Amino acid sequence: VQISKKRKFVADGIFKAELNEFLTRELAEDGYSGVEVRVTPTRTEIIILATRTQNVLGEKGRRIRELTAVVQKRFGFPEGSVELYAEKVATRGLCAIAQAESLRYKLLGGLAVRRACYGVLRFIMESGAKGCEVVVSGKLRGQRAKSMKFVDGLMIHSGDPVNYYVDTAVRHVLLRQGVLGIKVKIMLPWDPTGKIGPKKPLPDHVSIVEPKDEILPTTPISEQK
Amino acid sequence: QSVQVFGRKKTATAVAHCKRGNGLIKVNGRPLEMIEPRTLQYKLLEPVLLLGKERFAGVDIRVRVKGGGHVAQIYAIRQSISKALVAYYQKYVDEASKKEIKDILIQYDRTLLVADPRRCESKKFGGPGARARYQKSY
Amino acid sequence: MLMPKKNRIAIYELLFKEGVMVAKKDVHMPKHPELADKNVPNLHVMKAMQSLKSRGYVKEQFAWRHFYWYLTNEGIQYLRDYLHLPPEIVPATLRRS
Amino acid sequence: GHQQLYWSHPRKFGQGSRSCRVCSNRHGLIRKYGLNMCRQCFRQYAKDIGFIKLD
Amino acid sequence: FPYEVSDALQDDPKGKYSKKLLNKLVG
RNA sequence: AGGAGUGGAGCCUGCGGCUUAAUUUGACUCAACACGGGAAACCUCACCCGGCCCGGACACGGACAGGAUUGACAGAUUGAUAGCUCUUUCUCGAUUCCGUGGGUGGUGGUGCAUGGCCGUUCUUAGUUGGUGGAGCGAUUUGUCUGGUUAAUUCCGAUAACGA
RNA sequence: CAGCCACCCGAGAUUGAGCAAUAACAGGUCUGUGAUGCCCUUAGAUGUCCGGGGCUGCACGCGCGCUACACUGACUGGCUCAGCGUGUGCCUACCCUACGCCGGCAGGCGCGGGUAACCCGUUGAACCCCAUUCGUGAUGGGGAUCGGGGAUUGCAAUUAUUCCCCAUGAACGAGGAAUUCCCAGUAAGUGCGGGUCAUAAGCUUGCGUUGAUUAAGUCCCUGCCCUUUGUACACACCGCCCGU
């Protein structure tokens, strides 16, 4: 097709949003974490990061096939060009959506809100996150709705470092008396050249190398190596 | 071939292409004195009599100017001309004459070869201007 | 009201081929460009949707003004039994999952 | 089946012709860059489309 | 640790069941 | 200290009501009153007037294959294509008749049941542990008399120190 | 000391925004949806639909802003420029349009340039000029200049929100109370581009376009914060409470 690139990019963004929403209302029950889309000549590959790769793959390799068909009617993409790859996540306890859905299913599986929040707090610190908050709001008791917070570790709330040092997941949880809201915010730790943290430190953090402990010479000498 | 010197004021920008000549000054199809305003004319004439006609008699500089507004197009022609003359003298003849003319121009006007950094400020919603705000009733 | 049997057979075969069919509830469009040429209006989509909802042989999901059916094993069995199709009919492609 | 009563007045020049691509909302629709989005849904999927709040 | 009783206590320190939870935690 | 709107003239959204076919669905202030991106010719208002429906899944259960006609052509319409009940003529039929409901859904009300989002306190400079000190204790100090800063921003003082 | 003020120097000696804690408000939003806990089940259950009118019309009071407040203004405007940025579409001819033809005119024809630093576009408006024409009116400083001439490859322009043409006129002499908002490319002076949009900007959101006597201060007002202080308040002064 011939197309102005501005419209191309906004339509591509709408395409990504459509994928994300369809799979969030679709693939959530399978430990959904996220989706990465690769563009290759005349085809688009859809790698799925999800903690439950066996659930999404399913028996007989059924469901992971069917999805490729179900999008094909809506997007109108060429046949054969669309394919998806279901992978297990590389960010288990540091992808906010993963433990947000986890908490969703704890609350759905007859587990207390405070106990579930404490458990995910424990798990998140076991992963090694510098801090976590779980803002759960709703009618936790009676009919007077209220909020409820579980903050531990530390957490930055302002500035650019929030975008990449904080993973934020806002989800709606089913309840008998209404709809609860869950906000799971994880402050990602820092590791360099690693796979669990951003490659740059907090800009307000200054780290100093300890200087060498060389003994000061007291008489000039000629060293032959 | 230009002295590669440019000159700006507001969004406007002017450069004086420079060559060996006899001090004939031209601005985009017109010399330096037939510029339309005829009241800003003194602003364009500022350098050529600020330092004299003799210094503008051995170099041909054509000032091309692109920018918004009349007066903002000015303060670019004049500054470009003055800074082009100073750069031509600095890179070709000597510094003593160049230093003298630079001191003269700075003493008359320190913003004769430095640009004016000020630019129009953005507008914030809930108001028409940068700092003006919408009226409301108490 | 008289929902055609021929259109039903065509729709059932189209669903059986891949596992999904172009479903919209908009009435301003009489027939979808894929749904045209076979007398398939909006009400046909509505009736098929509600009949399969009550039947439960496919699970319905609605997202961004679009519908999606989960063709189950029971769905395949009932489709074969009511369409009287041969038993070796099943979407079972393996290439490029 | 309702074709002999509807389509009595073609609808291709008004706000009924354009609807939100998520919630079928005809109020507060954004048509810039073919978004066809409403304000609530656009800000709901703002980071996914590609726009980021930085200015 | 009985985190159930403690968490129910932190839900309502002065609740209708507060005395029962406080008594449960004692011991 | 100065630059402008009104109880100074025509135009744009909301209230006391539309006894016609009719707003009712937000605010007694900032933080309602060119706001809901609200510039509805009709289409978005279902709101208001015969506003075609069975197109109220229930296989409820039963007589019956006719269970039936969502079509246009006429006193079958004083409103072009409203066959929105007048036994006509239907020409091409297997959908169905119906009360135990978050069901083919509802821009119908509960926001003083909610979530999400946003507004506001507040863009102010405020907030809180740990260990130590004081108090039986709730608590308190730290988080301060001062100078400084846009800022508990720093300095300094200092039973606090380090965050 | 932390720092503040003034200066040779230097592009710049405070650019503007974005994000923005603890706690909360019965702030708004069920008018965004099986994201929602209650009524609608007996032929109005909306899942289909509307032929027509409603917020465009009223004794009225209000809120934002524009056109005017003069001979710092105007009566062919003759010559000189940029800035943000939008634009060829599959739910749909539903774009910006360069150039010649038709007419003083809304608009139609063709070849098309542009899927864009490729074309509009070197984005030729606001302005500064004038060796001829306004002169203190109620008017060439002005608008229902009342009513008739207009119309868009698209449902009918009806108190007609679109429109090019042809005098009259309400009104206003700086707007007695009460006062928005304003720290340098700031106020003000205007035009353009998006959201609006089938044509539709007094709105709004950005953009250049001219450049200020004014302020380097204070708590006088309005608030807000802190400290000390009092409290019989703690649902927290919209509190509590006394007596007839």
Tab-separated table of C-alpha atoms (C1' of nucleotides) in Angstrom, chain F residues 1-18 21-23 25-27 29 32-56 58 79-80 82 84 97-128 144-150 153-156, chain G residues 1-4 14 19-69 143-144 154-158 160-161 170-182 187-188 195-204 212-215 224-227:
chain	number	residue	atom	x	y	z
F	1	A	C1'	3.110	51.029	40.358
F	2	G	C1'	0.767	50.014	35.879
F	3	G	C1'	-1.627	47.096	31.356
F	4	A	C1'	-8.165	45.078	31.086
F	5	G	C1'	-13.963	42.599	31.526
F	6	U	C1'	-19.145	44.939	34.351
F	7	G	C1'	-25.087	47.329	37.135
F	8	G	C1'	-21.433	50.163	29.815
F	9	A	C1'	-24.230	47.909	23.575
F	10	G	C1'	-25.458	42.290	19.614
F	11	C	C1'	-23.837	37.097	20.003
F	12	C	C1'	-22.255	31.048	23.219
F	13	U	C1'	-23.448	26.488	27.658
F	14	G	C1'	-26.259	25.676	31.824
F	15	C	C1'	-31.502	27.017	36.275
F	16	G	C1'	-38.033	28.663	38.217
F	17	G	C1'	-41.147	26.015	33.790
F	18	C	C1'	-42.150	23.568	28.165
F	21	A	C1'	-45.294	15.784	20.127
F	22	A	C1'	-40.759	17.662	24.076
F	23	U	C1'	-34.295	19.244	28.376
F	25	U	C1'	-29.581	12.922	32.940
F	26	G	C1'	-24.209	17.966	37.027
F	27	A	C1'	-22.998	21.850	40.355
F	29	U	C1'	-17.900	28.995	46.153
F	32	A	C1'	-20.546	24.729	38.484
F	33	C	C1'	-21.894	29.143	34.797
F	34	A	C1'	-17.272	28.792	25.570
F	35	C	C1'	-17.478	22.465	30.902
F	36	G	C1'	-19.158	17.184	29.882
F	37	G	C1'	-13.958	18.154	24.044
F	38	G	C1'	-21.984	19.723	24.443
F	39	A	C1'	-20.670	23.805	16.836
F	40	A	C1'	-27.621	17.602	17.825
F	41	A	C1'	-30.742	20.261	9.928
F	42	C	C1'	-32.571	15.171	10.814
F	43	C	C1'	-28.656	10.609	12.141
F	44	U	C1'	-26.051	11.566	18.578
F	45	C	C1'	-31.694	12.073	23.041
F	46	A	C1'	-33.688	6.180	23.719
F	47	C	C1'	-35.439	11.346	25.801
F	48	C	C1'	-41.135	13.223	23.576
F	49	C	C1'	-45.440	11.336	19.546
F	50	G	C1'	-49.224	4.261	15.913
F	51	G	C1'	-40.988	5.067	18.450
F	52	C	C1'	-41.492	-2.417	11.939
F	53	C	C1'	-39.688	-6.189	16.461
F	54	C	C1'	-40.599	-12.027	18.901
F	55	G	C1'	-35.758	-10.502	17.281
F	56	G	C1'	-38.865	-11.695	25.707
F	58	C	C1'	-36.123	-21.662	28.329
F	79	G	C1'	-47.147	9.659	6.007
F	80	A	C1'	-42.720	8.019	-2.387
F	82	A	C1'	-44.690	2.294	7.384
F	84	C	C1'	-47.860	-1.105	12.219
F	97	C	C1'	-46.620	-20.285	21.273
F	98	C	C1'	-44.918	-18.726	26.540
F	99	G	C1'	-44.248	-16.086	33.629
F	100	U	C1'	-38.926	-19.721	38.189
F	101	G	C1'	-32.818	-14.580	35.636
F	102	G	C1'	-26.154	-10.847	36.244
F	103	G	C1'	-29.643	-14.472	29.404
F	104	U	C1'	-30.900	-12.541	22.561
F	105	G	C1'	-29.470	-5.886	26.977
F	106	G	C1'	-30.704	-1.044	29.112
F	107	U	C1'	-27.530	6.824	27.379
F	108	G	C1'	-33.553	3.744	32.429
F	109	G	C1'	-32.008	5.158	38.238
F	110	U	C1'	-28.487	4.089	42.734
F	111	G	C1'	-21.052	8.170	42.149
F	112	C	C1'	-24.046	9.426	50.055
F	113	A	C1'	-22.772	0.446	46.639
F	114	U	C1'	-18.210	0.574	43.523
F	115	G	C1'	-13.678	0.152	40.269
F	116	G	C1'	-10.776	2.863	36.669
F	117	C	C1'	-9.962	7.906	35.444
F	118	C	C1'	-9.756	12.883	36.720
F	119	G	C1'	-10.471	17.254	39.816
F	120	U	C1'	-9.198	19.413	44.663
F	121	U	C1'	-6.303	20.164	49.255
F	122	C	C1'	-1.199	20.962	46.017
F	123	U	C1'	2.478	22.135	42.941
F	124	U	C1'	2.247	24.334	48.123
F	125	A	C1'	6.640	21.605	51.206
F	126	G	C1'	5.195	18.562	53.289
F	127	U	C1'	5.404	12.828	55.061
F	128	U	C1'	7.659	8.356	57.632
F	144	C	C1'	14.605	22.845	65.786
F	145	U	C1'	15.571	28.997	68.534
F	146	G	C1'	18.025	31.181	64.151
F	147	G	C1'	20.358	32.422	59.068
F	148	U	C1'	19.494	30.691	54.094
F	149	U	C1'	16.516	28.607	50.001
F	150	A	C1'	11.997	28.234	44.862
F	153	U	C1'	16.845	23.627	50.281
F	154	C	C1'	21.020	23.855	53.064
F	155	C	C1'	23.964	25.808	57.038
F	156	G	C1'	24.079	25.906	61.895
G	1	C	C1'	29.272	29.124	57.044
G	2	A	C1'	25.065	27.965	54.089
G	3	G	C1'	24.263	31.699	50.813
G	4	C	C1'	22.639	36.825	48.646
G	14	U	C1'	16.682	32.131	37.025
G	19	C	C1'	6.297	13.961	36.308
G	20	A	C1'	5.163	15.054	41.106
G	21	A	C1'	4.745	12.147	48.483
G	22	U	C1'	1.472	10.991	53.239
G	23	A	C1'	-3.158	11.145	53.575
G	24	A	C1'	-7.882	12.374	52.310
G	25	C	C1'	-13.050	14.750	49.863
G	26	A	C1'	-19.520	10.969	50.810
G	27	G	C1'	-15.752	16.358	44.674
G	28	G	C1'	-17.391	14.442	39.376
G	29	U	C1'	-18.067	10.413	36.416
G	30	C	C1'	-23.100	3.962	36.495
G	31	U	C1'	-24.089	9.079	29.752
G	32	G	C1'	-17.475	4.000	28.466
G	33	U	C1'	-19.061	-2.132	28.156
G	34	G	C1'	-20.534	-8.843	31.713
G	35	A	C1'	-15.761	-3.716	34.537
G	36	U	C1'	-20.027	-3.458	37.929
G	37	G	C1'	-23.707	-5.338	43.684
G	38	C	C1'	-30.575	-3.889	43.024
G	39	C	C1'	-35.850	-2.901	39.601
G	40	C	C1'	-37.550	-3.997	33.608
G	41	U	C1'	-40.453	-11.418	33.192
G	42	U	C1'	-47.683	-11.454	31.182
G	43	A	C1'	-46.472	-9.146	23.261
G	44	G	C1'	-42.778	-1.047	25.124
G	45	A	C1'	-36.782	-6.439	26.254
G	46	U	C1'	-34.010	-1.113	24.348
G	47	G	C1'	-30.520	-6.968	21.783
G	48	U	C1'	-34.622	-3.703	16.190
G	49	C	C1'	-36.316	1.313	15.919
G	50	C	C1'	-38.017	7.362	15.073
G	51	G	C1'	-42.111	10.721	9.887
G	52	G	C1'	-41.815	15.063	13.251
G	53	G	C1'	-40.166	18.478	16.537
G	54	G	C1'	-35.991	19.697	22.361
G	55	C	C1'	-31.915	22.283	24.990
G	56	U	C1'	-31.811	27.306	17.896
G	57	G	C1'	-38.398	29.774	20.591
G	58	C	C1'	-39.597	32.882	26.306
G	59	A	C1'	-41.520	38.826	31.345
G	60	C	C1'	-36.150	37.238	32.830
G	61	G	C1'	-30.940	37.487	36.327
G	62	C	C1'	-26.037	35.385	35.307
G	63	G	C1'	-20.755	33.529	33.292
G	64	C	C1'	-16.634	33.392	29.292
G	65	G	C1'	-15.132	36.326	24.659
G	66	C	C1'	-15.540	39.236	20.299
G	67	U	C1'	-16.846	43.778	17.228
G	68	A	C1'	-16.444	49.572	19.272
G	69	C	C1'	-14.932	53.450	21.953
G	143	G	C1'	-24.671	45.686	12.636
G	144	A	C1'	-31.027	42.102	12.322
G	154	G	C1'	-23.871	14.794	0.309
G	155	C	C1'	-31.820	14.356	2.648
G	156	A	C1'	-33.964	18.114	1.695
G	157	A	C1'	-30.617	25.516	5.719
G	158	U	C1'	-37.417	25.673	8.974
G	160	A	C1'	-33.151	28.834	8.621
G	161	U	C1'	-25.408	27.762	13.392
G	170	A	C1'	-30.267	50.760	17.026
G	171	A	C1'	-25.957	51.535	20.746
G	172	C	C1'	-21.012	53.489	22.884
G	173	G	C1'	-17.854	60.162	24.649
G	174	A	C1'	-13.699	54.952	29.030
G	175	G	C1'	-18.184	52.189	30.977
G	176	G	C1'	-20.721	55.534	39.460
G	177	A	C1'	-20.601	49.352	42.664
G	178	A	C1'	-17.046	45.259	42.316
G	179	U	C1'	-12.792	43.705	40.504
G	180	U	C1'	-10.603	38.998	37.132
G	181	C	C1'	-5.195	37.927	34.908
G	182	C	C1'	-0.561	39.479	34.481
G	187	A	C1'	1.148	41.963	29.220
G	188	A	C1'	-0.986	44.019	24.950
G	195	G	C1'	-10.152	19.491	17.855
G	196	U	C1'	-14.000	21.040	16.014
G	197	C	C1'	-15.733	19.634	10.396
G	198	A	C1'	-20.646	16.620	4.749
G	199	U	C1'	-19.615	23.412	4.346
G	200	A	C1'	-19.163	25.351	9.787
G	201	A	C1'	-15.262	29.297	14.545
G	202	G	C1'	-16.855	34.650	18.825
G	203	C	C1'	-14.828	28.291	21.644
G	204	U	C1'	-10.651	25.738	22.583
G	212	A	C1'	6.681	48.268	27.210
G	213	U	C1'	6.802	53.151	32.427
G	214	U	C1'	6.519	49.462	35.061
G	215	A	C1'	8.726	44.638	40.313
G	224	C	C1'	-2.922	28.905	52.874
G	225	C	C1'	1.058	26.846	56.051
G	226	C	C1'	3.778	26.734	60.689
G	227	U	C1'	4.708	27.853	65.996
